[PDB]
Amino acid sequence: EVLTGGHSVSAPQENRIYVMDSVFMHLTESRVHVYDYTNGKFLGMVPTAFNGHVQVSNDGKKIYTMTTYHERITRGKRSDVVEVWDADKLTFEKEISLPPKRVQGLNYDGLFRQTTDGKFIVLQNASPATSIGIVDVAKGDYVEDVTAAAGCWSVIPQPNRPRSFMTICGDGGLLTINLGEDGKVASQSRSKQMFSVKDDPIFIAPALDKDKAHFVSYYGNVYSADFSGDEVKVDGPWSLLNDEDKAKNWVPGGYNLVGLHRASGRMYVFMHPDGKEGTHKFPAAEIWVMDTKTKQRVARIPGRDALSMTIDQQRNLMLTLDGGNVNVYDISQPEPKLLRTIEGAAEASLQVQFHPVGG
């Protein structure tokens, strides 16, 4: 026998999920673990140094990471980068230099995103002044710094436009940025106030439809941003809660805590009872399933202490993640059905993502 390298991941792209392991206890050795959701098999990994973030290219061909190096880890010159990796060979291809202010923080989806057309990576900076950085993937260059987004946070791509995204601002409204084909800002707009920052703060995680996004609040309200037109129209609140729910102080909690099943309009939200100040990141006691058209709950199931989720539209799946274990659910019908749990998928993960299949 002879040991060989150069091999590709053994399972098809459509089976693959990406568990971003912060390894917070040893945060300089964060990594992405690649699993097959159909059988729980470990398929490989991508090292991501200090507090890595990850996404898969919309065309499914590449993995993008964002990380920070120093010449001697704990001393020496800093290099913030995006790396491009081949998705099948799990090999490094290209480093793209960033200014030394890429967001260091927990793995909310909205900190490291891409345009719908896949041509630009859109990432959050904090120095601690905030701005949004644009990377041209083809050119391998940082091409734009959106200072218009100062005082805003996170990136919500618009799936109905090729190079548009929104961010949540300190006024409780949204800033929309439309990039040109060069990755520079081509236009922008600001919505009216959607939510009261002080009185009903929203979680940043969107329940994202093709042409609208829903957001849940610390107190269990729902707000929406409709981007069917060039100007975003905002609305809300409606309550997730009926009177019985209110009596037991049910509120949302988690990190990447919501999801939307686009074909049905069902929104999935992690909820826990006995809500009060300081419980907004509590593990889920339940997952609630909301009909966003009727603005009413349709189902509730045990939450398995989950903190983060993600949805696959085309296979009608939901993953949930409790920090270490990934639960796989069929959401083809209104009540989710638990298919399996992948134990020990990470030591400290708050983000799981499917390999894109939609092109």
Partner: protein, 122 residues
């Protein structure tokens, strides 16, 4: 009041995530990491910036402003990890937010530990 002076308290009390001033810590308490509530462990560097919290002191009944400064430039301490969230808000209220590394602007941004510095009455 004695409740304002952690160096005079029992170490087990201050090293607990339930200690009143640790009400918005996301990190390893520096007092468990070879430092104290207001001193970085040897060879780690204070952060010039921080998230800020308002914490209730049940011992004197008053509310205090706390600045959560990190110590930086050494790898994760790993001891006394807390994830408390009283009055913590998302990144659109950036200086109330604790899911970001408040070592981010240090000469070396590697996160070592966190602490809770008493600013004054809220």
């Amino acid at each position: 009041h004695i409740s304002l002076n952690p160096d005079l308290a029992n170490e087990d009390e201050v090293n607990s995530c339930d200690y009143w001033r640790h009400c918005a810590v996301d990190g390893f308490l520096c007092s468990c990491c070879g430092g104290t509530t207001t001193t970085c462990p040897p060879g780690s560097t204070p952060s010039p910036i921080s998230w800020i919290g308002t914490c209730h002191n049940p011992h004197d009944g008053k509310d205090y402003l706390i600045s959560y400064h990190d110590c930086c430039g050494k790898t994760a301490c790993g001891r006394c990890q807390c994830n408390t969230q009283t009055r913590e808000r998302p990144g659109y209220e950036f200086f109330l937010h604790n899911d970001v590394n408040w070592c981010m602007a240090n000469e070396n941004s590697t996160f070592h530990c966190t602490t809770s510095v008493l600013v004054g009455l809220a």
